């Protein structure tokens, strides 16, 4: 099959910026290339067909062009809504093949997260596991260090993070970090703390509670 090599793998540009996404065919593919936009949890959507033709109902800021085996997608003026993974596609010969995608990210001013810690509930405990949740709300950039401390001892390998997609309007992220212990282990400790380090905070923020008080 024909390989479609897409670069860059990800990028960050501000609102109003001219973004350029490149895709290179390994063999001749004529002008039989299309471009798609995929938002998380949803189907791909057609932007461009036959290399250079805007598909109806797509904004004019999306355009396309060809240079032999090089194919380019240009977003002339990036918008907050354009957060997505973009894919090129040749359909010149079977199998039709996709590039591996380009994750576009909206760059903006720094914003510090508010932080919240949640203790485990009575229902979950009896099952033999306790989950402690730390929430970072509406922050930018994505990059954030979230550290768990239990009785002031730094934890490793027992937490998992998840992050929402960039907010369609204010271009921030939110983040959940869940610390999972056993009911037995959780019952042996008092102070549960979530420590957050981030570009927008002048020094690390800590939120904690004590087991036995809540």
């Amino acid at each position: 099959d024909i390989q479609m090599t897409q670069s860059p793998s990800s990028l960050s540009a501000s609102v109003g910026d001219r973004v350029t996404i490149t895709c290179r065919a390994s063999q001749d593919v004529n002008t039989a290339v299309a471009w798609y936009q995929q938002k998380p949890g949803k189907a791909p959507k057609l932007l461009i067909y036959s290399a250079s033709f805007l598909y109806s109902g797509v904004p004019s800021r999306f355009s396309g062009s060809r240079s032999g085996t090089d194919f380019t997608l240009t977003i002339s003026s990036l918008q907050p809504e354009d957060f997505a993974t973009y894919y090129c596609q040749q359909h010149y010969t079977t199998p039709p093949t996709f590039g591996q995608g380009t994750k576009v990210e909206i760059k903006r001013t720094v914003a510090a997260p508010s932080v919240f810690i949640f203790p485990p509930c009575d229902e979950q405990l009896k099952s033999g596991t306790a989950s402690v949740v730390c929430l970072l709300n509406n922050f930018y950039p994505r990059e954030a260090k979230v550290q768990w401390k239990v009785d002031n001892a730094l934890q490793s390998g027992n937490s998992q993070e998840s992050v929402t997609e960039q907010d369609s309007k204010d271009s921030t992220y939110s983040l959940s970090s869940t610390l999972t212990l056993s009911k037995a282990d959780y019952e042996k400790h008092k102070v549960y703390a979530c420590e957050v380090t981030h570009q927008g905070l002048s020094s690390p923020v800590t939120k904690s509670f004590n087991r036995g008080e809540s």
Partner: protein
Amino acid sequence: EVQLVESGGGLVQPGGSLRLSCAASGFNIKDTYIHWVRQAPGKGLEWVARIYPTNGYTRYADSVKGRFTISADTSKNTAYLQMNSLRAEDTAVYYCSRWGGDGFYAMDYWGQGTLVTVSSASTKGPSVCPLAPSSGTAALGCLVKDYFPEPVTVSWNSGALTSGVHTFPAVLQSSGLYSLSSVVTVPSSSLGTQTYICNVNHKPSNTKVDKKVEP
């Protein structure tokens, strides 16, 4: 009104089989080619197969040929994907799609996708745990723990509360079970003036839950 709707996806054991369907309306599939394209969680798009429903000619990607069979029924306006000898690698959302045109070979319309999970692990419903606001801005939430397979959906106050809501992508734990949090930020003074209920639905296990989040 052009619509493509996939069905048949679900949980099936490795070595087993499953039949998917792609029902078309607003156009006749005889006038074009229909494709199946799949996406494994976190991965790119992979074309699986296609069919020209008029004469029934089929093509397959190497990764599925001999195991998968694409077909169509032009009178029912529907394409099918018979999937046999299923492997862990086949786990993906499966989209059906069309070219829909004479000299227009881009994929202009796509269905919403059907999730195929190939695993020996059995179905299990989530426990739903309220995350209480502790006391500017207050936060509360719901933890939806240890369910399998995906997907879980969550809304707040039957979809009436949307502002400030964050429903996080599920994480896969080492146990082989999923869990996810949904939270919402609200004004601290609002805590005495409204109830907050998270509505959790896990279709695979037919588990519906409505937990009130009390301060």
